[PDB]
Design a binder for this molecule. Structure first.
Ligand SMILES: Cc1cc2nc3c(=O)[nH]c(=O)nc-3n(C[C@H](O)[C@H](O)[C@H](O)COP(=O)(O)O)c2cc1C
Ligand SMILES: Cc1cc2nc3c(=O)[nH]c(=O)nc-3n(C[C@H](O)[C@H](O)[C@H](O)COP(=O)(O)O)c2cc1C
Ligand SMILES: O=C(O)c1cccnc1
Ligand SMILES: O=C(O)c1cccnc1
Lengths: 191, 191
């Protein structure tokens, strides 16, 4: 069921490269995003999908140095990210947001918020789709630190605002324990 | 598959009250939220689930008047919402957000954003879960207009910030046509 699928999605930090079908994975990622809803069907999400050489480059040449060259003013956490099969960088196209604000100024204040919600939406739908394939993932946030260098290396338009980075790969160790709130404190039903 | 489930979720405006098992529906809604990820497992989402009398009250006594008593300074759109089986109001608990900002001030700026993303996440997971049950839904945003009156009528804590309202019920007419972007304009793959 769909509920079971949601349940199978978890944060997996121990990731490897035991991935059997790269293309199938890529297609699944696109689909998860394609069939995700967005305000006005604006489809503001953008993805950079890195595997192999680019995966190593992101973490060894970009994240790590900018992290270390910042602390001044890490591993083997970074080693754990690099060791994964790939990283999916989620952006939101600010250009579309601005246009929407102009075309429909009645909702100018909303589009930014709906865009943010849209990033959460596609991020978890990809995350869950990958879990269904038996692949694990975890979501990182080294934005805005690495924004500039990522755009430069992969020639991304300036309008792509980085929101998060979903590291993914083969599951090499199970998710940890997780707790839940009391239902009574977050659900109210009235008839 | 999970992809199929995502695909089955659509915006349905023609809704009715041909719902067979209210309790099963309620349980499904809770589960969709329960198994949704949130930053720091903060679980900031809160739901008010209205059916029957409360459903009618929301749209007839709250939304409509405040909408009309605002325009001065509608139907049968509102009639279409009221005609549905219920409305799920999604809130984000600002109290938890603030505490997080204090406990982890290193991420003070993030929690607000992660909270917003969290609302999108649980909203679409509920939306999709309902679709799997054969029920349709559409997402409305009469916040912040109706915030105050909703809190008053159902004695909600002030800390619950309303984010959206998902009207749901039996599908009485199919979704309209929808277009998609060119893949080339929103997906970049590098290896
Ligand atoms: C964050 C968000 C906000 C939305 N706001 C509204 C709204 O206020 N009123 C409405 O009727 N639909 C709203 N929509 C529905 C979208 O227009 C719809 O999901 C999109 O056009 C794709 O169509 P689909 O839901 O049938 O897949 C919203 C969707 C999202 C994800
Ligand atoms: C919007 C959002 C932001 C998150 N930020 C991070 C992060 O920066 N680093 C990290 O390791 N996990 C992050 N998480 C993972 C959550 O802590 C995790 O989903 C939550 O504890 C529930 O655990 P689960 O993913 O195994 O279900 C984030 C999750 C969400 C939904
Ligand atoms: O198309 C939408 O998503 C929409 C419709 C009405 C109001 N706000 C957004
Ligand atoms: O637990 C989280 O979600 C988390 C972990 C590290 C950094 N930011 C968030």
């Amino acid at each position: 069921s769909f509920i079971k699928s949601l349940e199978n999605r978890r944060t997996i930090y121990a990731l490897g490269r035991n991935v059997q079908d790269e293309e199938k994975v890529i297609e699944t990622i696109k689909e998860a995003v394609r069939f995700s809803p967005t305000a006005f069907n604006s489809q503001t999400g953008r993805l950079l999908i890195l595997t192999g050489d680019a995966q190593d480059k992101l973490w060894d040449e970009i994240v790590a140095p900018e992290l270390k060259a910042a602390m001044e003013a890490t591993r083997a956490k970074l080693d754990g990210f690099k060791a994964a099969f790939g990283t999916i960088l989620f952006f939101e196209d600010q250009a579309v947001v601005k246009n929407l604000q102009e075309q429909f100024a009645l909702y100018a204040d909303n589009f930014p918020v709906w865009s943010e919600q849209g990033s959460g939406i596609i991020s978890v739908n990809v995350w869950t789709a990958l879990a269904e394939l038996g692949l694990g993932a975890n979501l990182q946030h080294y934005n805005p630190l690495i924004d500039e260098a990522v755009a430069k290396e992969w020639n991304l338009p300036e309008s792509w605002k980085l929101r998060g980075q979903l590291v993914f790969g083969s599951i090499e160790a199970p998710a940890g324990e997780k707790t839940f709130m009391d239902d009574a404190d977050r659900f109210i039903v009235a008839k």
